[PDB]
Amino acid sequence: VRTIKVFTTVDNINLHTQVVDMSMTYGQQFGPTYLDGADVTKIKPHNSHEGKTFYVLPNDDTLRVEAFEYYHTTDPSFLGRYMSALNHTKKWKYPQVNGLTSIKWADNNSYLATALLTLQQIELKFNPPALQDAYYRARAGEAANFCALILAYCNKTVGELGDVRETMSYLFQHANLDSCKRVLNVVCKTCGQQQTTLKGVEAVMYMGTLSYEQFKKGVQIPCTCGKQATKYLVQQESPFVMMSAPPAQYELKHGTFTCASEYTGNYQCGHYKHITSKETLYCIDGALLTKSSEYKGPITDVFYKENSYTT
Ligand SMILES: [Cl-]
Ligand SMILES: [Zn+2]
Incomplete structure (x- = not known):
């Protein structure tokens, strides 16, 4: 008999009018239900809820389309994990x-x-x-x-x-990197040379060295024949590159990179800081800020500006 009007949503834009019975939980009426992240599935409607927006899981075809168009995922647990x-x-x-x-x-x-x-x-x-x-x-x-x-x-x-x-x-x-392009050449003194082209995300990420200049000069990798071959960057078209490696002591030089991440700890436990190269080197650690003219630490990822590079 007693009801309030509420709105349900999956994207917080498209609203769906509902009339809820205040004698039943939200879960009994909608399934899992959230109010600005709080799980109200086991709760009964409050007077103050009238006119408010609740997230629900995509439980009909309209909501399934709304959720995919907004989030670009159909993982069934996504909205509950986002709310949690x-x-x-x-x-x-x-x-x-x-x-x-x-x-x-x-x-x-x-x-x-x-x-x-x-x-x-x-x-x-x-x-x-x-x-x-x-x-x-x-x-x-x-x-x-x-x-x-x-x-x-x-x-x-x-x-x-x-x-x-x-x-x-x-x-x-989930970003538009479609135009990013990377060309690599791998040279083995036994097997010869092989060129490879990478696109999209794979064109901007590399794991094995922090140094963009070392990647241009060449990095040593295994060849299937057993000898060590040299891999080097022939061509790069992207607005940035990201060079990553397992944490190692590394010196960051003002003006030679955009920003970097530092990890102190081990494989089970640790802490990250951010280093950004501006008018000097700033180290941002959450709310904390320090500055230095030089920086050395256990760096894991370095970002560099790019536009077009050709060897
Ligand atoms: Cl929605
Ligand atoms: Zn070889």
Whole structure:
């Protein structure tokens, strides 16, 4: 008999009018239900809920299409994981540090801070509307939805150990890198030379050396014949490149790179910091900021500006 009007949604844009019975839980009426990230499935409607928007899972064809068009995923657990993360990230603080949105440390989130800082320094356009909209808000300082989307797209929960390289790979999958192109040549003194072309995400990421100049000069890799061959960059067309390696002591020189991530710890436990090269070297550690003219530390990922390179 007693009812309120609420709206359900999967994208927080398209609303769906509902009349709910205040004697039944939201779960009994909608399935799993969330109010700005909080799980209200086991709760009965409150007077204050009238007119508010609730997220639900895509449980009919209209919602399935809305959810795919907004998020570009059909993983059945995506919206519940996004909501579970948002209930935490909405409580984080996002200070402006040296002109960039950072994240005050909470919930083991240092890998997310350095990823967020990196994104604001490289040219990248996302494809899912969810990421376009949330990234716009993040740049303005309201990064809770963007951070909870990063967790959901990477299948990481709040508090879980994350890797910056893997996180960036997920975000780049959902970005328009279609025009990026990389040409490599591999030279074996026994077998001869082989050229390879890479496209998209694989054209901007490399694992094995932090140094873009070393990649141009040549890096040693195994050949199937048993000798060590040399791999070198012949041609690059992209607005940035990302060079990654297992953490190692490495010296970062002012003016020779855009930004970098530093990892202190081991394979089970550690902490990330961000280094950015501007008028000097700034080290951003969540809300914390220090400066130096030189920098040495256990670097894992370095980003460089690019446009067009030909050997
Ligand atoms: Cl919706
Ligand atoms: Zn060979």
